[PDB]
């Protein structure tokens, strides 16, 4: 965030100067990553079983 302040009045003092300030932004990222599994089985066990 920027930051305002009380200025005062002077042509010559360190006060009466309006101080400068900065708004800033940053980056966030969605990065896609892969989750997986392999599940191997004998084909004869698929053939013999009573369920899918």
């Amino acid at each position: 965030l920027p930051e305002a302040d009380w200025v005062g009045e002077s042509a010559t003092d360190p006060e009466g100067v309006i101080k400068t300030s900065k708004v800033t932004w940053a980056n966030r990222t969605l990065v896609a990553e892969e989750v997986a599994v392999i599940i191997p089985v004998p084909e004869a066990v698929i053939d013999d079983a009573t369920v899918e």
Binding site: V7, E9, S10, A11, G16, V17, I18
Partner: protein, 48 residues
Amino acid sequence: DNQINLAERDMVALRLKARFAYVLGVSATAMGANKTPVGVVTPDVTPP
């Protein structure tokens, strides 16, 4: 050290300017060639 930044101090200024010239018509008359059109009374410096 004498620098004033107007916007940085919330100030303004009036700049006032003029452009002027002057010429004296030292020139010829019926009396001669380079006659001056002005004379002066100078102040008294006597000690009386």
